[PDB]
Structures are given as structure tokens and as C-alpha cells.
Design a protein around this ligand. Structure first.
Ligand SMILES: C[C@H](CCC(=O)NCC(=O)O)[C@H]1CC[C@H]2[C@@H]3[C@H](O)C[C@@H]4C[C@H](O)CC[C@]4(C)[C@H]3CC[C@]12C
Length: 305
């Protein structure tokens, strides 16, 4: 018994799952070869036995959020405000901690539309919409600071508690969901990253949980693909079940009929592969969900989808 607690997945349909890389619901399953791209997200990362990796944390509304205090407005561009960051749970940020950036920090390049809000000790408040540019030279969260931009040029206070609530993309300039920010700015390498992931057996492709996030203007499918839904990460953190091999065989199952629709490989380091080819969404019955079947090895041959 000891050291062999059985592994399980939560009982949740696709309409009951959340994206772990942007704070919205899952819309569909998706597969693609992503030919030539390095897939290395830092949010939504966990081992199957419950160790969170990268910048991953547990609270859904802290995904892509920021907290801190504004120490100064930029003198020659009053749309820009210097935010000195804390952790999203309110504790001070320790740059010496062995993570790439404060937990929850965005893990992709974009102009992110959102709202900057404040509440003073006397309960006077203000909030203004604007943009967090994760590609900016001044996006240096691992050093403790980022720049916020707003249309408002006067009505934000210095040295008062501040939060950034993300909403979506402002436009598509610089948007690339697989391009990591430089968390310490220009000429400095990222540290303590969760590793890139790829299929390791011929005929297989990654399977993603995909959301189409809001866009304020332009043309885009707004796709944000995560490797594990947030609820699976929360489940593994609680359960802490050991992994006896490299790969768990899982099956998408109708719970009323028992019919198994397809099977997939769930890898120890926290991602899914399927036997499939091409770029396509995957339509599943609204009532089904993945169930654990058995433990196998990296070279197990899946039935084709
Ligand atoms: C401060 C950042 C990043 C600028 C930057 O680092 N540029 C490169 C460089 O300086 O080297 C910029 C990028 C997009 C900008 C925003 C967008 O252009 C939209 C909008 C435009 C308005 O005229 C001013 C407010 C507002 C909301 C801009 C504020 C400043 C932002 C948020």
C-alpha cells in the first residue's frame, strides 16, 4: 500500500474545466504538430504526482494577474506607470526564489488588455483600463517591476495597493502564445524554467485544452492552449499519488454508456499525446471525461483517433 496510492483524474466534463494559462473556461480540445515551434509554457505546469512547476500556482483568478504599488509615473509619458510588484497572494516577492518570475505572471508575448485598480486605507478607490505589454524592455517582473499603460494620465495614486485584472488581447501586435517573455529584461537569460514538451514516439501529437480569449480589435482566433486544465493541477496537488512509470494510459469515456471514444498518453511531467495528424479541433460528447486506465511505457502504441 504505502508508496502505491492509486492515481485518479477528477470527474469533470469539458464544460466544467478551466484554462490554466488565461483565466477563462475551456472551449474545446485541439491537436496540432506545431512544426518548428518550441512549446514551453510556464503556467499550467505540474507533475502527475502534484509538484507545480514554472510559474504555476493554484488560484484561478491569479493567472495573468499582478499586484503591487506604483512608485512613480514616467515623466515624459504620463500614460506609463512603474509598478513595483509583490506576489499575487499579497506576500512580498523574493527574487532569490527558484522560479522564473512571480507565480502567475503571464507566460506569453502580447499586449494584454485589462484594468488597473486601487483601494486606499480610507477606502477611496479608482480603476482605469489599459494595457500590460509583456514584450516591453520594462517588463522585468523577476527584477521586481513592470510598466502599466493607461489612457488616463492623472487619476492613479502613488504608494497605494494596486491590482491588474487581465481581460484579453488589446490587439495582435507582438502576440505569440509560445514566445516566453524575458522575465529579467534585455540580455538576461530566464532561469528555473519548466522544460519544453513534444511527442516522443512516431505518429503522435500533443493534445491541448484550448480557449479563444477576448480581443478588443482586429482579427484572431485568440487561441491559448494549455497542457493540463487548472482543475487537474489542483487535483494532483491534493492527491499526491506516485507515478510508477513514465506514462498513464487514459480513455475518454461516456459515464452513462461506458463507451470509450478514444485513448491518449498522459506523461509523468504533465502533458498529453494522441495518435493523430494535422491541425484540427476535437469534438467530444458533452457528458464524457477522461478516466485513468493503466500505467504503460513511452513506446506504447495508441489506437488512432
Ligand atoms: C508602455 C507600453 C510599452 C512601450 C515600449 O516599451 N515600447 C518600446 C520601447 O520603448 O523600447 C506601451 C505599448 C502599447 C501602449 C498602449 C497602446 O498603444 C494603446 C493606448 C494608446 C494611447 O495613445 C495611449 C494609451 C495606450 C493604452 C498605450 C500606453 C502605453 C503602451 C501600453
Amino acid at each position: 500500500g504505502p508508496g502505491s496510492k492509486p492515481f485518479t483524474l477528477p470527474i469533470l466534463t469539458i464544460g466544467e474545466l478551466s484554462n490554466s494559462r488565461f483565466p477563462v473556461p475551456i472551449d474545446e480540445l485541439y491537436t496540432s504538430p506545431n512544426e518548428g515551434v518550441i512549446v514551453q509554457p510556464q503556467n499550467g505546469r505540474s507533475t502527475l504526482d502534484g509538484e507545480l512547476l514554472g510559474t504555476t500556482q493554484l488560484v484561478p483568478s491569479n493567472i495573468c494577474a499582478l499586484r503591487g504599488r506604483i512608485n512613480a509615473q514616467v515623466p515624459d509619458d504620463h500614460h506609463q506607470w512603474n509598478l513595483q510588484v509583490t506576489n499575487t497572494n499579497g506576500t512580498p516577492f523574493d527574487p532569490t526564489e527558484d522560479v522564473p518570475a512571480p507565480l502567475g505572471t503571464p507566460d506569453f508575448l502580447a499586449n494584454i488588455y485589462g484594468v488597473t485598480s486601487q483601494r486606499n486605507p480610507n477606502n477611496t478607490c479608482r480603476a482605469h483600463d489599459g494595457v500590460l505589454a509583456t514584450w516591453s524592455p520594462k517588463f522585468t517582473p523577476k527584477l521586481g517591476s513592470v510598466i502599466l499603460g493607461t489612457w488616463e494620465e492623472s487619476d492613479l495614486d502613488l504608494n497605494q495597493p494596486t491590482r491588474f485584472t487581465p481581460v484579453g488581447l488589446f490587439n495582435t501586435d507582438h502576440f505569440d502564445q509560445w514566445a516566453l517573455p524575458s522575465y529579467s529584461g534585455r540580455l538576461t537569460l530566464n532561469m528555473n524554467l519548466a522544460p519544453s514538451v513534444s511527442p516522443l514516439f512516431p505518429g503522435e501529437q500533443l493534445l491541448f485544452f484550448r480557449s479563444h480569449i477576448p480581443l478588443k480589435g482586429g482579427t484572431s482566433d485568440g487561441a491559448i492552449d494549455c497542457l493540463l486544465p487548472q482543475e487537474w493541477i489542483q487535483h494532483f496537488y491534493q492527491e499526491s499519488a506516485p507515478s510508477p512509470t513514465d506514462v498513464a494510459l487514459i480513455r475518454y469515456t461516456n459515464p452513462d454508456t461506458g463507451r470509450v471514444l478514444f485513448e491518449a498518453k498522459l506523461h509523468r511531467q504533465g502533458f498529453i499525446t494522441v495518435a493523430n495528424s494535422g491541425s484540427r479541433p476535437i469534438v467530444v460528447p458533452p457528458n464524457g471525461y477522461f478516466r485513468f486506465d493503466s500505467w504503460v511505457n513511452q513506446f506504447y502504441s495508441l489506437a488512432p483517433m
